[PDB]
């Protein structure tokens, strides 16, 4: 259920390990699409169901003529959504060049529908997305405990925690604003908010505070947009909803470059994307520092770039990771029988290492977000040696 | 704490040495302004000395150097 | 019934925590109108009940014509005094501006009758207010114990305690003058006492080289202070004040013209000539903005906006600890769960649900009273037990246990 | 016309003195509505005049039935347009509480008109108020110089400059945003901004780019109070689309105890809390050792500010420089029996007998733009257009 | 013809300027397809002539059917050769996916000619490509001098020189293996070479107290990189590559494998091959965003859009300097002054007129060739300019 360095480990030693791992110089977390299921979010398996239920003729067009999707793969709900966007884009580009009119419209429709379905799954609150004080509801309860626990375990003179994520939704911002804490994400201004790469080198100081962190969104956001002038701006939820989100959701208008998000396999196709590169440079610079710890939760292990990066950080003899994977044994067995997908081979390769710096957790529902948060400890205020207390119980043990 | 306040004075230097009818003075630096309004920055002038009971009158003779330091030499002529 | 950071903790852990807190650099206490209930005072609920049964026609006029008090709140006793006073003041201001006559005189009588009830409840001893040695009675035992406990716990090189309050009575002044301690409250002189903001920075010293002292901040004024026409504030003694201007307020009617300065109003920023009020709150805000600070709150009802905002905003400092006492916590939780609750109850429920280990809340009914709060505070341990033979004592005892 | 305690001065000595003062630790600037006229602003007299000749049929009730305006002041264009709004709000609240349907409808029209004249004179760009990069234009050119030379002159280890203002427009915000520096105005957040009074004790640093502090003494256009008893701030576009548009382009409508400009709904305990903090911060700053103050554009129409200003002069380290254009025309009245209280106060400030106050007068010689020139001194478009050309 | 903001400056001032930019914190060089023409290479418009003179039958179908190239460009020899192979691979891939059997031969037959043409021009030695010690010949006399001059004028505590290129041949490797220098290029191993992107942050040091290494970024691939059956990129030696696949490409006339080769920027649609291309560009963009950089450009034709866009944006930093060699200013200035020429001419002439001191353009025909570039660079005082070792080696060989 819990493995370290290939061997098996027990619960008490795991708790003692987790406690002493939070005293190091660097602490960070990387969250995925599963960490927001308890708030109103969805996964990539539900998007395919929604697509195949709402649009029943485009599915037949995909299956019969172009042969992009097979029948059995669609029946079992085992078709990758990211790998289909790239193929559709390739077909559209080829058709456009040779001046074909009829075959150019269908792929436009497919891309518009597939982009619309992805957007709906990130609001988390439906039409209530435009209101205010959305962090006061009971759903955003464990995000607050996560931030409080992370931020209170910081001795003076150290560095603030860092958070990476691949969601488009505003869960962390809603949680932190209701709590009163500030996060730095590279933007500045109110009437004209712009992206500045050098805004990641700042910090607070007291004129005569101390509660803040950083936030990196690797695959873009739902309130970001580019006005084609090689600048990127950020606005509020209500302004974005009144500007473009509502038209996409309801008016079924054709999709354009309203907001920059990155669903797809190859992220290097876009050439003028200078935020993705900055985010990944800052991510790659974080894991090369000595005395670092990282906790991974909700990540499905299906991205080439990210797990390509993770493997290269195990050549440093001061790096530690803890990985939460619910369905570990099913991945364990399928590999011995011939192998599963590329997603399930990576975790099995990671587990079977021989370094006492990789820990993998499994166990179904005991490796969830709520289970994750409660494992983190609270600071000890007013520490004391307490030697005489153990002397007293070492009296009582013989008194037994 | 209460109303009573005592000190109100505005000088330009202090005596640092006596050598047999010859006086050395060091000029202030940290004062943002020596404004009170008269200022003496040149030989030939006259200066005064509060000795508690009487006033001693002198006459400036020299200036020189050696945040650096400035110095003045004077001679005494009478008292008031 | 004791929470810390949302979770629960028992009696012994609480006592060790309370012992640890009293060893820090700064310690202070904030008291409310419920702390002086065991001495002879009374709360606002009693003020409203005694008001409604003394001037029936004025209450009837308030309910019927001016529509300021609902017919239901009068019977269930939920009327708020401060908001009523402010509304009456606004009505008087507009009546003065539009030059109406009858309504202005009608409101003057109400505004005068309302202050008489407030003043009568702060005397604490009735007729013996104008007498001496009032702190020798047994009603002031726990005030003396609180003062003795606070001062004894300091170390050389540390600062003296501070006391903030919103009462008008003299219980805490009477108590100290029986111990011989000195309280600094910002006044000087005997034949003419005047207020000086500068002398909050004074301390004793011995010429051959009286070491006990403290400070007292009164946020809502006092029953002894009175302002003269020259825009200065003077202070007298209890006997002189009773003999010159609060024998005409009580026995005789319609005699209130700014005779003494208090703040029974909800909006205290409107008065643009009260600088004592702005002096006290500045010091209060300055105290809780320092490292290594502890604050104990007792008797407060959490119905004041400025204080709630100040307390909430100080919780982002990593060296601030509060302990809040609140008797009726269970009812507040129950009522908030149903989507209702008073504006005071949401504030106290919100504090209890925070995830920082720097907030502690105590409930329990009669276990969170004033006399119980004093008993929690520790006695100083002089001569920390020499040698380490207490370990041998514990062995000898516990091995046979 | 340069005076110093009844004396006279020439240009060069003043230009040296202002530099000498700027080498201090605590430096501050106080402004007024006089600095907004060079960008498209107005004054109290102008808006009062505009009000009189647009709504004359209801001017009588402000003098006959309710006694809000002095007839001499109305015919003299000297009324103060801040207390009128406050008293109108008090009257409307009392009427609404009394359930007087007949008299409740009277004051709503008056308030609707007054807010229309107030808002019309503060957009500074008309219908372009909601657009972006509005601080890039040539009109907002002089403001950038002030901030630049205030930041540059400060030595390492010095405190940041502080700025106080009576205006409630978005003028300095655009200048600072298009310069590329950050100002702390006391709010924080994006999807819900809230007022925290303790943010005034913050500062940046480099982990191995500057800032300044901005106080608004009378509110701003982008603040309001919603149903929940909390104060919010939005952008220019959001405010325009929410409430500002209807106020200018509708006949008759009123919301109530909503807006926080200018000094309006002081009768509530949630809105006065913000008003008090700015004033107490100014009072605490102005009473510190080794401070300076460069007053400009202020007509001395406030009783309370002068009381604080005079009292702080008891310390010898408090230096004041005033810029009062129409000085002699006040002296002439002062010699006569007539005058006004602001004129009496300013001439009393003239007739002092010490070298700490420095009054400056004249015509165009004492304007905001001239003051910008007195303070010391501290191709990208080609590359942008070349990149866009590709 | 030397300009600096529009003002002509003499030779000695230019030399004193070059001497001062070679002692900054960061120094770089960019080289194009004209820099290897003194070794046996060809330019881009010499390849089109050979193709259209050797295969006149496919040229009609490649213009009149699939609209892959214009008539004006193919008449004026202005074809972008490596931008056509990518589109051809896309066409072939889509045809293979949808199973159109008649269209596969028409693309498998032209991709076999494009490679047969571009491959042969990059060998530089014909049949001697598989032999050893190719760096001892006289064609590579100036590459050695460039590498030697770049390394010898660094002071302790300073970075290493960086070299970027768009050539995909082996000239620089052969030159550097003869001096004994080691060049990092992202690969490690001998019995299996593999691509490790994180080793661009590694450096050497001496255990006794050496500083002899540099970095090489190949933007368009190499002849010796290929993708085997598994999804990893390998590197081999020149002899091994020649015996594995190059011989059949040059000789056999119906040889096409599939998505196998990694030159020149071809199989970009695949998500494990575009990863290699993306890293080089990300690091190129990162290099020129530093406080004290100086970059020399030689052999480049300015016929690219992304590189021009990156270079223009890096000039809004007051401490970045550029030096440009272009042997055709005279024939471009007039064509722009009268009516306007091409995009390359427009770019270079817009750059020439800028009123900066940070740009310098050099022209004059043979006066701005690769060979002339080397002697403008300095030469250290203590660098040994003699020949003593070789005489001793000759005497040793003569012995016995
Ligand atoms: N309540 C839960 N708590 C924690 N984990 C959970 C929970 N429920 C499910 N999981 C696990 O959470 C995981 C969810 O798997 P996927 O939906 O593929 O998450 P992703 O973020 O990788 O997918 C996003 C893709 O798009 C992006 O652009 C990236 O490129 C991705 O390719 C599974 O392991 C679940 O068992
Ligand atoms: N013996 C006791 N010991 C401690 N607390 C007690 C006791 N008896 C009652 N309480 C609690 O005491 C608490 C407060 O009683 P209230 O009179 O409502 O407090 P306030 O909100 O008026 O606060 C006082 C001032 O606040 C305003 O600003 C005005 O200026 C007031 O004068 C209640 O919770 C009781 O349960
Ligand atoms: N172009 C100019 N340059 C310089 N000074 C000028 C200029 N134009 C006018 N002035 C001067 O600047 C003065 C500004 O006139 P007013 O608008 O009454 O002054 P305020 O806005 O500061 O007073 C309003 C505040 O005071 C009260 O408390 C109110 O409630 C507000 O809080 C003119 O009289 C000229 O002397
Ligand atoms: N001996 C010489 N020395 C120096 N320069 C020379 C010499 N001979 C010719 N030239 C010049 O060398 C230049 C030859 O330019 P070309 O080979 O067409 O351009 P590229 O190498 O960028 O082509 C590849 C790019 O194509 C895409 O754009 C991608 O971005 C690729 O990077 C001309 O200016 C000649 O005058």
- Cα-to-chain-centroid distance, residue A25: 23
In this structure, chain D runs to a length of 390
Angle among Cα D34, D38, D41 to the nearest 5 degrees reads: 65
What CA–CA distance (Å, rounded) separates C239 from C129? 7
Q: For a substitution probing ligand 4, which of E298, E327, E329, E332 has the most ligand atoms within 8 Å of its CB?
A: E327
Residue E22 CB partners (closer than 8 Å, separation 6+): E153, E294, E377, E378
Among candidate residues C305, C35, C291, the one with its CA nearest the CA of residue C164: C35
φ/ψ of residue A398, rounded to 5: -75, -30
Angle, nearest 10°, between helix axes D101-120 and D44-52?
130
Structure tokens at C390: 């207490």
What is the rounded CA–CA span in Å between residue E207 and residue C240? 92
Helix (H) or strand (E) holding E184: strand E182-184
Judge whether C201 and C212 are in contact, CB under 8 Å: no
d(C-alpha C265, C-alpha C270), whole Å: 10
Instruction: Report the candidate in E185, E191, E204 with the shortest Cα–Cα distance to residue E240.
Output: E191
CA of A175 to the centre of ligand 1 (A): 21
- What are the φ and ψ backbone dihedral angles of E227, each rounded to 5 degrees? -115, 115
Residues C57, C60, C65, C69, CA torsion sign:
positive
Contacts with E167 (C-beta within 8 Å, 6 or more apart), sequence order: E31, E32, E33, E35, E36, E41, E122, E220
Cβ(E1)–Cβ(E329) below 8 Å:
yes
How far is residue A210's CA from residue D327's CA, in Å, rounded to a whole number? Answer: 51
Closest to A259 measured CA to CA, from A216, A215, A227? A227
> With an 8 Å Cβ cutoff, is B5 touching chain C?
no
Q: Cβ distance E176 to E183 under 8 Å? A: yes
- Residue A84 has a CB neighbour count (10 Å cut-off) of 19
| Among C15, C35, C146, CA closest to C370 | C35
Contact B33 D24 (CB under 8 A): no
Residue of D77, D261, D325 to test ligand 3 pocket, by largest number of atoms within 8 Å of CB: D325
Which chain D residues have a beta carbon less than 8 Å from that of E316?
380, 383
Q: How many C-alpha atoms does E363 have within 13 Å on its Cβ side? A: 15
Looking at residue C221, the DSSP 8-state letter turns out to be B
Q: Which residues of C touch B2 (CB under 8 A)?
A: 188, 196, 198-199
**What's the token pair of residue C286?**
């300055």
Question: CA-CA distances (angstroms) from residue B49 to B13, B22, B56, E322, E399?
Answer: 11, 14, 5, 69, 101
Q: Which of C31, C43, C77 to mutate to test the pocket of ligand 2 (most atoms within 8 A of CB)?
A: C43
Tokens 């939005």 -> residue:
D234
Given the DSSP bridges, would you call strands C162-165 and C213-218 parallel, antiparallel or unpaired? parallel
Pair C298, C29: CB distance under 8 Å? yes
Q: Which helix (H) or strand (E) holds B47?
A: strand B46-50
Contact A221, A253 (CB under 8 A): no
* Reported structure resolution in angstroms: 2.9
Backbone angles phi, psi at D205, to 5 degrees: -165, 165
- Rounded Cα–Cα distance for residues A25 and C42 (Å): 56
Contacts of A270 (CB under 8 A, 6+ apart): A262, A276
**How far apart, in whole angstroms, are the C-alpha atoms of residue C196 and residue C180?**
23
In this complex, is the C-beta atom of E397 within 8 Å of any C-beta atom belonging to chain D? no
Nearest CA in chain A to D177: A189
Neighbour order of strands in the sheet with A224-226 = A187-188, A194-195, A232-234, A224-226
Rounded (10°) CA dihedral E225, E231, E232, E235 = -20
Determine the distance from the C-alpha atom of residue A265 to the mean position of all C-alpha atoms in its chain, rounded to a whole number: 16
Rounded to 10 deg, the angle between the C81-98 and D83-98 helix axes is: 110
How distant is the Cα of E6 from the closest Cα of chain D, in angstroms? 15
Sign of the CA dihedral D249, D254, D260, D262?
positive
Q: Do D238 and A237 touch (CB under 8 A)?
A: no
Instruction: Identify the chains in contact with D, defined as 3+ C-beta pairs within 8 A.
Output: A, B, C, E
Enter the tokens of residue E206. Answer: 């001496």
Q: Is-contact A381 C357, C-beta < 8 A?
A: yes
| Rounded alpha-carbon distances, angstroms, from residue A8 to A328, A331, A374, B47 | 14, 17, 22, 93
Closest CA to D90 of C363, C55, C95, A303: C95
Q: How far apart are CA D362 and CA D365, in angstroms?
A: 5
Provide CB contacts within 8 A for A126, sequence distance 6+. Answer: none
Contacts of C62 (CB under 8 A, 6+ apart): C68, C69, C110
CA A386 distance to own-chain centroid: 42
| Burial (CB count <10 Å: 0-12, 13-18, 19+), residue C194 | middle
Greatest CA separation for chain B:
46
DSSP percent split of chain C into helix, strand, coil, nearest 5 = 45, 10, 45
Q: Is C255 on the interface with B (CB under 8 A)?
A: no
Phi, psi torsion values for B69, nearest 5 degrees = -130, 150
- Which residues in chain D (1-40) have CB-CB distances under 8 A to chain B? 20, 23-24
- Residue A121 contacts by C-beta under 8 Å, 6 or more apart in sequence? A41, A42, A46, A47
Chain C hits for B4, Cβ within 8 Å: none
How long, in residues, is chain A? 400
Q: Do chains B and E touch by CB distance (3+ pairs < 8 Å)? A: no
* Ligand 4 lined by E363 (C-beta under 6 Å): no
Q: Read off the DSSP letter of residue A86.
A: H
Question: Is D355 in contact with B32 (Cβ distance < 8 A)?
Answer: no
Tokens in use for B6? Answer: 């005592």
Given the structure tokens 């005596």, which residue do they identify?
B15
Provide CB contacts within 8 A for A29, sequence distance 6+: A146, A150, A161, A163, A164, A294, A295, A296, A297
Residues in chain D after which the backbone breaks (C–N beyond 2.5 Å): 208, 378
CB-based contact D355 B35, cutoff 8 Å? yes
Cβ distance E197 to A66 less than 8 Å, yes or no, reads: no
Contact call for residues E207 and E237 (beta carbons, < 8 A): no
Query: Per the structure block, which two tokens stand in for E347?
Result: 């770019």
Q: For residues D84 and C97, is the Cβ–Cβ distance under 8 A? A: no
Cβ atoms of residues D164 and D217 within 8 Å: yes
| Bridging pattern class, strands C26-31 and C162-165 | parallel
Asked if A177 reaches chain C (Cβ–Cβ under 8 Å), the answer is: no
CA distances from D302 to A93, C273, D31, D220 (A): 70, 15, 13, 19
- Residue C327 CB coordination number (10 Å): 15
Crossing angle between the packed helical segments D272-286 and C305-313, to the nearest 10 degrees = 60
CA distance E290 to E284: 11
What CA–CA distance (Å, rounded) separates E275 from D238? 42
Minimum distance, in Å, between the CA of residue C298 and any CA atom of chain A: 24
Strand order from edge to edge, sheet including B13-18 = B13-18, B23-27, B70-79, B55-65, B46-50
Contacts 24+ apart (CB under 8 A), C203-210: C210/C182
SS3 A287: coil
Beta bridge partners of B72: B25, B63
Instruction: Check D355 against B33: CB less than 8 A apart.
Output: no
Q: Which DSSP category does C252 fall into?
A: S
Chain centroid offset of residue E138 CA: 20
Q: How far is the CA of A375 from the centre of ligand 1 (A)?
A: 21
In D207-246, beta strands by DSSP E = 211-216, 223-225, 231-233
**CB-CB under 8 Å, B1 with C202:** yes
Q: Is E291 exposed, middle or buried (0-12, 13-18, 19+ CB in 10 A)?
A: exposed
Q: What is the Cα gyration radius of chain C?
A: 24
Which tokens go with C46?
């009693």
Q: Which residues, in sequence order, are CB contacts of B47 under 8 Å at separation 6+? A: B40, B57, B58, B59, B60, B74
Asked if residue A359 lies in contact with residue A323, where contact means CB atoms within 8 angstroms, the answer is yes
Residue with tokens 């950089």, as numbered in its chain? E293
Instruction: Indicate which ligand has the atom closest to the C-alpha of A330.
Output: 1
Instruction: Dump strand ranges (E) for C76-141.
Output: none
Beta pairing, strands E26-31 & E162-165? parallel
Cα separation of D118 and D88, whole Å?
Answer: 15
Q: Rg of the Cα trace of chain A?
A: 24
Which residues, judged by CB distance below 6 Å to any ligand atom, belong to the binding site of ligand 3? D 32-34, 37, 43-44, 80, 82, 166, 218, 297-299, 301-302, 325, 367-368
B2 in reach of chain C (CB within 8 A): yes
Nearest-angstrom CA–CA distance, C37 and C124: 9
Q: Quickly count helices (H) and strands (E) in chain A.
A: 16, 14
Eight-state DSSP code of residue A66:
I
Nearest-10 Cα torsion for D185, D189, D190, D194: -70
User: Apex CA C138: angle with CA C132 and CA C143, to 5°?
Assistant: 90
Q: Quick one: tokens of B38?
A: 């008269």
Q: Touching E: which chains, 3+ CB pairs < 8 A?
A: A, D
> Cis bond leading into E264, ω under 30°?
yes
In Å, what is the CA distance from E203 to each residue of A355, E159, E182, E190, E212? Answer: 25, 10, 11, 20, 10
Taking the CA of D364 as reference, the closest ligand is 3
Q: Are E256 and E108 in contact (CB under 8 A)?
A: yes
What does the block give as tokens for C38?
């065991």
The bridge status of strand C187-188 relative to strand C194-195 is antiparallel
A300 lines ligand 1 (CB under 6 A): yes
Hey, whose CA ends up nearest to atom 30 of ligand 3? Answer: D82
Please say whether the beta carbons of A196 and D198 come within 8 A.
no
Task: Locate E128 and state its tokens.
Answer: 């001697």
User: What one-character DSSP code corresponds to residue E39?
Assistant: T
> In 3-state terms, chain E is what percent helix, strand and coil (to 5)?
45, 15, 40
The experimental technique behind this entry is: cryo-EM
E327 lines ligand 4 (CB under 6 A): yes
Determine phi and psi for A64, rounding to 5 degrees.
-85, -55
- Is E48 a pocket residue for ligand 4 (Cβ < 6 Å)? no
CA distances to A161, A360, A386 from A23, rounded to whole Å, are 12, 20, 21
Q: Which of E67, E275, E313 lies closest to A98 in CB terms?
A: E67
CA–centroid distance, A44 to ligand 1, in Å, is 8
Q: How far apart are CA E370 and CA E38, in angstroms?
A: 8
Q: Collect all residues with Cβ–Cβ distance below 8 Å to C258 and sequence separation of at least 6.
A: C227
Distance, in Å, from the CA atom of E151 to the CA atom of D349, rounded to the nearest integer, reads 73
Q: Is A268 on the interface with E (CB under 8 A)?
A: yes
- Which positions ≥6 away from C257 have C-beta within 8 Å? none
CB C291 within 8 A of CB C25: yes
Nearest to D257 by CA among D67, D86, D81: D86
Rounded Cα distance, D82 and D266, in Å: 11
The burial class, CB within 10 Å (0-12 / 13-18 / 19+), for C328 is middle
For C267-323, give the DSSP string: --SS-SS-HHHHHHHHHHHHHTSSSSEEEEEES--S--HHHHHHHHHGGGSTTEEEE
How far apart, in whole angstroms, are the C-alpha atoms of residue A68 and residue C242?
Answer: 97
Helix (H, G, I), strand (E, B) or coil at D133: coil
A12, A361 Cβ separation under 8 angstroms = no
Residue identifier of the C-alpha nearest atom 10 of ligand 2: C34
Adjacent-strand bridge partners of C226: C234
- A 10 A CB-CB count for E361 gives 20
Rounded to 5 degrees, φ, ψ at E364 are 125, 30
Name the 3-class secondary structure at C351: helix
At A224 the three-state DSSP class reads: strand
Q: E20 by DSSP, 3-state: which?
A: helix
- Rounded-to-integer distance, Cα D139 and Cα D38, Å: 8
Q: Assign D226 to helix, strand or coil.
A: coil
């Amino acid at each position: 259920s819990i493995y370290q360095g290939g061997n098996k480990l027990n619960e008490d030693d795991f708790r003692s390990h987790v406690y002493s791992l939070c005293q190091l110089d660097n602490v960070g977390v990387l969250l995925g699409a599963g960490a927001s299921v308890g708030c109103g979010g969805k996964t990539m398996k539900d998007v395919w169901k929604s697509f195949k239920q709402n649009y029943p003729e485009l599915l037949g067009a995909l299956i019969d003529k172009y042969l992009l999707v097979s029948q059995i793969d669609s029946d079992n709900n085992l078709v990758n959504v990211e790998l289909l966007i790239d193929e559709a884009t390739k077909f559209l580009s080829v058709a456009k060049t040779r001046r074909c009119e009829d075959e150019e419209e269908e792929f436009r429709k497919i891309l518009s529908s597939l982009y619309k379905e992805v957007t709906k799954a990130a609001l988390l609150t439906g039409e209530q997305f435009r209101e205010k004080n959305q962090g006061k509801k009971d759903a955003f309860k464990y995000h607050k405990e996560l931030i409080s626990k992370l931020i209170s375990n910081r001795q003076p003179g150290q560095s603030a925690p860092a958070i990476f994520t691949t969601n488009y939704d505003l869960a962390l911002e809603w949680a932190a604003e209701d709590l009163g804490i500030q996060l730095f994400n590279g933007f500045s201004g109110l009437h004209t908010r712009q992206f500045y790469p050098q805004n990641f080198d700042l910090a607070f100081r007291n004129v005569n505070g101390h509660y803040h962190a950083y936030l990196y969104k690797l695959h873009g956001s739902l309130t970001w947009y580019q006005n084609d002038s090689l600048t990127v701006n950020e606005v509020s939820a209500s302004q974005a909803y009144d500007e473009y989100i509502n038209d996409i959701i309801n008016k079924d208008d054709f999709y354009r470059g309203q907001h920059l998000i990155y669903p797809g396999a190859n992220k290097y196709s876009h050439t003028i994307g200078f935020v993705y590169g900055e985010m990944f440079r800052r991510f790659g610079e974080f894991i090369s520092k000595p005395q670092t710890a990282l906790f991974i939760n909700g990540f499905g292990f299906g991205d080439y770039h990210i797990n390509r990066i993770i493997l290269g950080a195990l050549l440093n003899p001061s790096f530690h990771v803890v990985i939460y994977y619910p369905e570990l044994k099913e991945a364990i067995t399928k590999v011995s029988k011939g192998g599963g997908s590329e997603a399930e081979k990576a975790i099995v390769t990671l587990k079977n290492m021989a370094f006492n710096q990789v820990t993998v957790v499994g166990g179904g529902s005991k490796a969830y977000f709520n289970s994750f948060v409660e494992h983190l400890p609270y600071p000890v205020l007013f520490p004391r040696d307490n030697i005489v207390d153990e002397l007293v119980e070492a009296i009582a043990n013989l008194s037994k | 704490m209460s109303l009573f306040k005592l000190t109100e004075i505005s000088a330009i230097g202090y005596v640092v040495g006596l050598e047999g009818e010859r006086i050395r003075i060091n000029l202030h630096e940290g004062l943002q302004g020596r404004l009170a309004v008269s200022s003496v920055t040149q030989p030939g002038d006259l200066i005064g000395f509060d000795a508690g009971n009487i006033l001693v009158v002198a006459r400036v003779t020299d200036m020189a150097f050696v945040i650096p330091l400035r110095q003045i030499i004077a001679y005494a002529i009478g008292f008031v």
